[PDB]
Design an enzyme around this catalytic site. Sequence first.
Site, PDB file in Angstrom:
ATOM      1  N   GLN A 156      39.865  -2.617  12.538  1.00 17.15           N
ATOM      2  CA  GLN A 156      40.360  -3.923  12.100  1.00 17.15           C
ATOM      3  C   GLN A 156      41.684  -4.291  12.806  1.00 17.15           C
ATOM      4  OE1 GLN A 156      37.704  -4.495   8.093  1.00 17.15           O
ATOM      5  NE2 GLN A 156      39.856  -4.004   7.668  1.00 17.15           N
ATOM      6  N   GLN A 199      37.934   2.419   9.985  1.00 17.62           N
ATOM      7  CA  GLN A 199      38.187   1.040   9.547  1.00 17.62           C
ATOM      8  C   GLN A 199      39.565   0.474   9.920  1.00 17.62           C
ATOM      9  OE1 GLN A 199      36.965  -0.287   5.528  1.00 17.62           O
ATOM     10  NE2 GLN A 199      38.989  -1.172   5.267  1.00 17.62           N
ATOM     11  N   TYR A 231      44.225  -7.264   3.817  1.00 17.28           N
ATOM     12  CA  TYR A 231      44.278  -6.620   5.127  1.00 17.28           C
ATOM     13  C   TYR A 231      44.380  -7.674   6.237  1.00 17.28           C
ATOM     14  CZ  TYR A 231      43.168  -2.164   2.962  1.00 17.28           C
ATOM     15  OH  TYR A 231      43.232  -1.038   2.183  1.00 17.28           O
ATOM     16  N   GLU A 260      57.662   6.448  30.397  1.00 17.40           N
ATOM     17  CA  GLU A 260      58.958   5.871  30.057  1.00 17.40           C
ATOM     18  C   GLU A 260      59.203   5.749  28.569  1.00 17.40           C
ATOM     19  OE1 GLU A 260      60.277   2.309  32.262  1.00 17.40           O
ATOM     20  OE2 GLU A 260      62.085   2.651  31.035  1.00 17.40           O
ATOM     21  N   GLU A 296      30.661   5.106  10.148  1.00 21.99           N
ATOM     22  CA  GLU A 296      29.730   4.213   9.475  1.00 21.99           C
ATOM     23  C   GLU A 296      29.790   2.870  10.247  1.00 21.99           C
ATOM     24  OE1 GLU A 296      30.152   1.461   7.077  1.00 21.99           O
ATOM     25  OE2 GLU A 296      32.341   1.392   6.837  1.00 21.99           O
TER      26      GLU A 296
HETATM   27  N1  LIG Z   1      46.927  -2.116   7.612  1.00 21.29           N
HETATM   28  C1  LIG Z   1      45.668  -1.765   7.338  1.00 21.29           C
HETATM   29  N2  LIG Z   1      45.423  -0.661   6.625  1.00 21.29           N
HETATM   30  C2  LIG Z   1      44.101  -0.444   6.442  1.00 21.29           C
HETATM   31  C3  LIG Z   1      43.046  -1.217   6.871  1.00 21.29           C
HETATM   32  N3  LIG Z   1      41.840  -0.660   6.480  1.00 21.29           N
HETATM   33  C4  LIG Z   1      42.179   0.430   5.826  1.00 21.29           C
HETATM   34  N4  LIG Z   1      43.539   0.620   5.768  1.00 21.29           N
HETATM   35  C5  LIG Z   1      44.248   1.749   5.157  1.00 21.29           C
HETATM   36  O1  LIG Z   1      43.689   2.951   5.667  1.00 21.29           O
HETATM   37  C6  LIG Z   1      43.490   3.904   4.599  1.00 21.29           C
HETATM   38  C7  LIG Z   1      42.011   4.134   4.388  1.00 21.29           C
HETATM   39  O2  LIG Z   1      41.427   4.615   5.612  1.00 21.29           O
HETATM   40  P1  LIG Z   1      40.267   3.816   6.375  1.00 21.29           P
HETATM   41  O3  LIG Z   1      40.681   3.506   7.755  1.00 21.29           O
HETATM   42  O4  LIG Z   1      39.764   2.688   5.546  1.00 21.29           O
HETATM   43  O5  LIG Z   1      39.173   4.986   6.437  1.00 21.29           O
HETATM   44  P2  LIG Z   1      38.272   5.480   7.658  1.00 21.29           P
HETATM   45  O6  LIG Z   1      39.088   5.839   8.833  1.00 21.29           O
HETATM   46  O7  LIG Z   1      37.223   4.474   7.926  1.00 21.29           O
HETATM   47  O8  LIG Z   1      37.624   6.797   7.029  1.00 21.29           O
HETATM   48  P3  LIG Z   1      36.417   7.095   5.990  1.00 21.29           P
HETATM   49  O9  LIG Z   1      35.976   5.727   5.515  1.00 21.29           O
HETATM   50  O10 LIG Z   1      36.963   7.977   4.881  1.00 21.29           O
HETATM   51  O11 LIG Z   1      35.372   7.793   6.834  1.00 21.29           O
HETATM   52  C8  LIG Z   1      44.226   3.320   3.392  1.00 21.29           C
HETATM   53  O12 LIG Z   1      45.576   3.764   3.393  1.00 21.29           O
HETATM   54  C9  LIG Z   1      44.093   1.811   3.632  1.00 21.29           C
HETATM   55  O13 LIG Z   1      45.090   1.054   2.955  1.00 21.29           O
HETATM   56  C10 LIG Z   1      43.335  -2.406   7.623  1.00 21.29           C
HETATM   57  O14 LIG Z   1      42.531  -3.213   8.075  1.00 21.29           O
HETATM   58  N5  LIG Z   1      44.686  -2.587   7.814  1.00 21.29           N
HETATM   59 MG   LIG Z   2      35.507   4.055   6.726  1.00 23.39          MG
END
Ligand SMILES: Nc1nc2c(ncn2[C@@H]2O[C@H](COP(=O)(O)OP(=O)(O)OP(=O)(O)O)[C@@H](O)[C@H]2O)c(=O)[nH]1
Ligand SMILES: [Mg+2]
EC number: 3.6.5.-
Lengths: 426, 155, 436
Positions: free
Chosen positions: C15, C11, C224, C254, C71
């Site tokens: 994003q 995620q 987010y 570099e 997912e």
């Molecule tokens: N800056 C930022 N942090 C994000 C975002 N989405 C999730 N996080 C952070 O990432 C962490 C959660 O991991 P995710 O990336 O949501 O999880 P994932 O990689 O999809 O893994 P699983 O869902 O456990 O399979 C937390 O610390 C969130 O605050 C986003 O769009 N931006």
């Molecule tokens: Mg996820």
Amino acid sequence: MREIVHIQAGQCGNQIGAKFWEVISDEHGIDPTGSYHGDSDLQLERINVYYNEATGNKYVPRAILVDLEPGTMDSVRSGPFGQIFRPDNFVFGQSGAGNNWAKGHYTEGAELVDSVLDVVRKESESCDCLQGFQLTHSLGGGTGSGMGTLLISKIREEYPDRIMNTFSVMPSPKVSDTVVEPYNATLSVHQLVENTDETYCIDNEALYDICFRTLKLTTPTYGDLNHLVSATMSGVTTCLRFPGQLNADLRKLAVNMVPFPRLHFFMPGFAPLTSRGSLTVPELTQQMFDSKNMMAACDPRHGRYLTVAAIFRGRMSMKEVDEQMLNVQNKNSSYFVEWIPNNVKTAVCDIPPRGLKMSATFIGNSTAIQELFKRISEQFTAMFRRKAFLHWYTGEGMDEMEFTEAESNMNDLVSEYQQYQDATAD
Amino acid sequence: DLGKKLLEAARAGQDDEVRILMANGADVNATDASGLTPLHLAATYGHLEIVEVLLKHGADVNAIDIMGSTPLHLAALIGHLEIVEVLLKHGADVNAVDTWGDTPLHLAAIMGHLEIVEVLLKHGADVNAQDKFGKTAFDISIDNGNEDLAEILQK
Amino acid sequence: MRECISIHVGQAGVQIGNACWELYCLEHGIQPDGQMPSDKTIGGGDDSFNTFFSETGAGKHVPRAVFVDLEPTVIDEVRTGTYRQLFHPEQLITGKEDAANNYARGHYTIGKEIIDLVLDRIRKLADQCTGLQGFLVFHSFGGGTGSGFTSLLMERLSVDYGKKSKLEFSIYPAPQVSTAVVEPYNSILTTHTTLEHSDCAFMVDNEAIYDICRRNLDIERPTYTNLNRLISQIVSSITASLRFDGALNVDLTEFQTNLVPYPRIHFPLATYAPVISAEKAYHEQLSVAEITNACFEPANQMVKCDPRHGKYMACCLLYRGDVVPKDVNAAIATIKTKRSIQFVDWCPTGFKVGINYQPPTVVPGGDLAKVQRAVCMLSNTTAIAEAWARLDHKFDLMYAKRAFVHWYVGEGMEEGEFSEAREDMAALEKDYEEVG
Ligand SMILES: Nc1nc2c(ncn2[C@@H]2O[C@H](COP(=O)(O)OP(=O)(O)OP(=O)(O)O)[C@@H](O)[C@H]2O)c(=O)[nH]1
Ligand SMILES: [Mg+2]
Ligand SMILES: Nc1nc2c(ncn2[C@@H]2O[C@H](COP(=O)(O)OP(=O)(O)OP(=O)(O)O)[C@@H](O)[C@H]2O)c(=O)[nH]1
Ligand SMILES: COc1ccc(/N=N\c2cc(OC)c(OC)c(OC)c2)cc1O
Ligand SMILES: [Ca+2]
Ligand SMILES: [Mg+2]
């Protein structure tokens, strides 16, 4: 993670199971014939989690109804949503279990378990991404407790990678003065500690106390009690049924709420408390953490919170909720373990439940739950010391060794809670 | 051996069989291997009529089994209010102590039989009697958070 | 022209990836369907922007990028968004069940069901390159996919692409927007297993970005969307030298030369100024001296730490906009006479400067005001060890009681892996102490 398969067993399991399906159907805009008549796209967004979509745009609960007693089917059928359930999902025996755990677990119940499993198999193969199972049952009787725990272990062997979750109703002599209930409940807790991932402990002692002392209903009945049960059940399943910031599921709830595999017994809470017929964010957060608002007869201020999840429903500032939650944790810091950083998680859902603009639902993994286990243990020991009614169990095939084993496992569970309550960070 | 059949008839609630067996010489004070008499068995299984007949035919109202349990301990534990009253009317020792230091009051308190708790108190139950772990009935009401029981014990 | 492939995992990576590629399109003049009217060569070319975009015979400019998640809900939003026609459809890969915030599921059980497909799809992109230089990998530390799957992927890329550079953009967890209690565990496990496979890693502390949004942008409760827009501005400022003509950090090698003195201390700190709210559209234009000074203020850093407590090993200043080189020289000479800046004795006490004379682009819908000059400073300071110590402490509190360990062990991980990862973090903390 999407589909949940729901199973309701015994008289209590079916009565609270039916009330759950009546309450969440109303929230999702589903009428008793299975048709959607709601006004928001948010109601159908995660409908697949609990309902199957049949031809003719009909949402049918993924609910399996089980009972050794035949008369339960009629009472479920005569309810408001009795015709919404699938006819082939009712698996009912010919004669009851007579509040005897050994009948449910080893004799009558074991003779009807393969039939229920065939139905589970069919509903599970109709799932694209099955996340797990939900079981509603009492621990005080014979069917929901004896056969229910047998069903859990059977499903656990065929689906060892899926989540097993229960809504388990704990006995109280205030609601049912039947002296073999501490036996049935203790034997079932021994099974629950080993075979479920997460258990919501709904205690009849707390339900009765709320109805009698808080709501001031002098003679509470199963209906008054089940109103508190259905509101809790709607509350704790909110993040499974509505979009929200998280794509919440049974496994992410387990991983973040359960630090030690045996300590998976949750204390739910609800605010505000209301009766059938009959708030600000700071009041809601205070009430939600109050001993009188818990659905387990345990004082949270006697123990420590290992983890907590709170769900707020309705229109309110998200910043208000963040500040008030931060404030409760800071001013009540001695009731949280300091070795699990950031152990309180909050969610806000836009859609509130029926007849309330605001609501808060508490899910706590607190060491104070040992108070509930100690109450049952003291009663089991009083009865077991005098061997009262043991022949009723041993005559059905049970060994007296199983009773001592359940007692020992329960007392070990209490010691484990005390161990983490006394633990310090350093 | 009519004593063995009388123990079984008292447990099964066979009123006619109890009357017949006593008429043919059956020991009303017979015991099983653990010292349970027909009176202990009738009192545990809720057979009020059998308790009354045995009391009119020489049953020892204060018989104790190997664990020190009296018929009153078992009536209080299982929750048979009508049998607790009959036992008290026939001279049952309200404050009898078993091998665990439990009195009938401790047993009615643990099991939540509040009406039996009220009866025991009006019949002289000792609120200061401690079990082998030093707990009185009031200590059990405090430790388990039973507000209803604590109020009755403070009457 | 040497190609760069970006890989977005889980995620957070997805994003943030979506916001970066939208900004890159606006900077280069690419429309959401891949059309670029300024590109006089159709069907190919060797322009600087070709490092990030391939070209089809129909003139479509396609990102050299792969989006992967266990997912599908987050990637489904890319498939339906404004930039849905921009990406290679086979470039967006999803499984059915996620890692449940568990490093072990992402790495050992669930992640293995898709690792071969992801590498095969990456090879199709690599095969289209004339001179691939490496990869830019975007991921959270806290997620199960972002932690575990990224680690498994970094191990595989090290075997199949031995001489190619690997740079990470990593999201460091903050309590205010966190998802899971076990994020300190996931953070340490992924840091230990990726350490030898990554050449340079830019950490983005969510708390730092959350605070900038609240203080500079006056956003009460940043979501987010607000964090990602600011993060994309910073990521763009760091990658601009790979996508445009310039004289500093012109290739992935570099970045290592300028910012990484030793293989393990490969965590540069990014500082960015000015961050001004779009509501202040008539703001006073800040000088080169003012924005340069703002780089030494802790409140403008991407990671929460205090560089006055550490020593510098490298410092690069990347300017964008109306910036005269002599104004930079004068500002640096002033900044040098300030006791808050200490370099290690074994490094030249110099600042490397690069200037791109085009001002930054603003995204429509964004919270930032247009500025005529901006700067991003990349520094390797031993004060970033403060970020590792805060995380290591959170890990130690839970691990001392073995809280949550059973979830990891139940997914094919050995308990010993926790202690091995923690000893590696202890060594990493001492690596910074030894330098200064
Ligand atoms: N800056 C930022 N942090 C994000 C975002 N989405 C999730 N996080 C952070 O990432 C962490 C959660 O991991 P995710 O990336 O949501 O999880 P994932 O990689 O999809 O893994 P699983 O869902 O456990 O399979 C937390 O610390 C969130 O605050 C986003 O769009 N931006
Ligand atoms: Mg996820
Ligand atoms: N809250 C609540 N408790 C209930 C309800 N029905 C029964 N119980 C409780 O459940 C226990 C008895 O279990 P039942 O569910 O009736 O028994 P069963 O599972 O059908 O088993 P058998 O009758 O022995 O075959 C007692 O503690 C009751 O107080 C109900 O509708 N609500
Ligand atoms: C203490 O920390 C955590 C607790 C729960 C976590 N996530 N799982 C869910 C959270 C839910 O409500 C807040 C929920 O409603 C009950 C839900 O429905 C199944 C899932 C994540 C956390 O970081
Ligand atoms: Ca071209
Ligand atoms: Mg029943």
